[model samples]
Target chain A: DMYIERAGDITWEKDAEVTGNSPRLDVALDESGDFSLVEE
Target chain B: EVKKGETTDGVYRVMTTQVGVGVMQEGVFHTMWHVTKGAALRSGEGRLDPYWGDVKQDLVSYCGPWKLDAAWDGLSEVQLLAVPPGERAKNIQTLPGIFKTKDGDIGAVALDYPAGTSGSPILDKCGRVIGLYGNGVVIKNGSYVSAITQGKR
Candidate 1:
């Protein structure tokens, strides 16, 4: 934001999970549903 | 102009694709009319076929990776293809362009292929890119750029 609520602009944040590599296990599994859905 | 009485006639510029034609058909084999546009105008050139000229809808479907000769008209002949016509056919024979390195790029790159691969019309002993091959000719595994984006670039 132009002005951080606490003060001026916050230069950095600690959220480095940009690539979705560290999603929750269930969340990741949910994503794999298409491939994991085995044929009948 | 196929008016009520306008005759449908065109002056086709058929050149050699392979080395020798061997007096093709000896008489006349029917190939598809690759194009019968305003035969009145010289926009495109030639029909497609050796003995059987069947102008399909999707030309790209039939065209594969053809060696590009520096004789293509689009001003660039690099890894060009001879796409076939399609069901939604809009342009046929537009893909198989002849050697045209662009007028500006080629310093006057007229559309034409080398004359003969060898000394004779059919015999390619030395197997070199000779002179005088007109545009719209097709050959396999030859050394030539299809188009040149030189001066035109």
Candidate 2:
């Protein structure tokens, strides 16, 4: 799974612990320039 | 007038912590309205199935119109005052950076990652809310702050 990890001095490493599926939500801007989250 | 100045100054004040960012409103500094990351506020380990479920009602009081921009010139000075749990907020300067993720190229910055700073607000020189601190990764030289960008509104 995808998660954030950290090292010394609070260095965060994404996918450092385990690398796998990296899922994220997509967002789009509307006519008024407002944004909304969209799902594929 | 005196009342107008108080109201204007209220909008300029910002309260930040792990919970989220509380932007003062209506000449009140102790308002509860907050803007934060859904992931950071999640209570479960699983991915956010229903995104709105992560947003607790009581914790979020009001949602107002504010400037939200996802575009970054990739070379603008930004700052964040990270208030870790039980610690005072520290003002830190951040360098423009990016982090490659499976979703897309996340706009990032190089800075020190203090614990409990996941929901901190990254502000521009004018103290405008630019982005939200989501997470980061450690590198040999330093750390990259992967932030959540809101589309222009």
Candidate 3:
């Protein structure tokens, strides 16, 4: 499956972080990357 | 999974971001996520002994709309809203702030109270939660507060 995604406003610099904890998928956004993502 | 000492008193906020997993069968806001030594609590004080519970029912992440009834009522403008209990429990701690924004003065708040906080922090005249001991002073008028913030995971 492609699971197509978008980085519309994703700040590849300092917006998102994946702190691989437990079954963790904690994709936190610093208000700068709380944008919407629609798969096409 | 909290077990407070049973000797303290006062209001307490979540140390780490709280995980209200539908509230552990009601009455007790179970810790749906996060890994804290003091997760759940007997009372809000956290004076009671700490426990290691998990994924209980009725636990709320933060102060939310609670019941599923009005959960989506005020969200009409949100044409593309994500339903509750949707996609990994709505990530409680970081979702909505005040379900209803108030008009009164909210004052400032402290930002670094450690990972697992307990009891409210002392407040400043300017309305900010200061360090624990910093809030201890009885004036001739009355007592005040400065809301401490729990640590983030």
Candidate 4:
């Protein structure tokens, strides 16, 4: 599957735990509950 | 304009969206219009960044293409894509835009895609940024219409 990802700075402060290395979790700099992405 | 994030240094940030498009759909059919606007956020300076990104990179190194030339013939050579300026829907439309103008000359017309609204990003078949989508002609086999004038930065 082809996809496009938009990245930015962590402007908004939220309690989001990122637990991984090789596959770093992705977040949309929107709201805290903006959800994380793990593309396979 | 969409505040597309770029680098993540301690106190620096970068962005690149205004060049493409940033408008809202307004009004009704036949009389509807699109209004161009600026970025919602107003607190930082953004360097340029591409629409796509690469992992393991801290600072954004590269961005997408910036189409400076407004060639009617180059535009007509491929199918164009209409990309929304906002970050809402998957509103992407493809159209054919080539024609014979009144002077019996061949050139592309500056038409607006998603008419009634005001702005959008036009992309060539190769997926490269071109210009504003709807500013060109939408019809074919019509009168010899002249092409849009170039006022790019």
Best by DockQ: 2
For residues B85-138, write the lDDT of model 1, one tens digit per residue: 111101101122222221222211122233321111110112111111111212
- CAPRI verdict on model 1? incorrect
> How would you encode candidate 4's per-residue C-alpha lDDT over B12-46 as one tens digit per residue?
11123322322111110010011211112222353
Stretches off by above 4 angstroms in model 2 are: A1-40, B1-61, B101-104, B136-144
| Candidate 2 share of real interface contacts | 0.00
- Candidate 4 has a DockQ of 0.02
Off by over 4 Å in 3: A1-38, B1-12, B16-26, B30-32, B35-69, B74-153
Query: Fraction of true inter-chain Cα contacts (below 8 Å) kept per model?
Result: 0.00, 0.00, 0.00, 0.00
Model 1 residue runs over 4 Å out of place are A1-40, B1-9, B12-92, B96-103, B106-140, B143-153
TM-scores of all predicted structures: 0.14, 0.45, 0.19, 0.30
Number of the top-ranking candidate, with lDDT as the measure: 2
Worst 10 contiguous positions by lDDT, candidate 4 chain A: A20-29
Ranking by lDDT: 2, 4, 3, 1
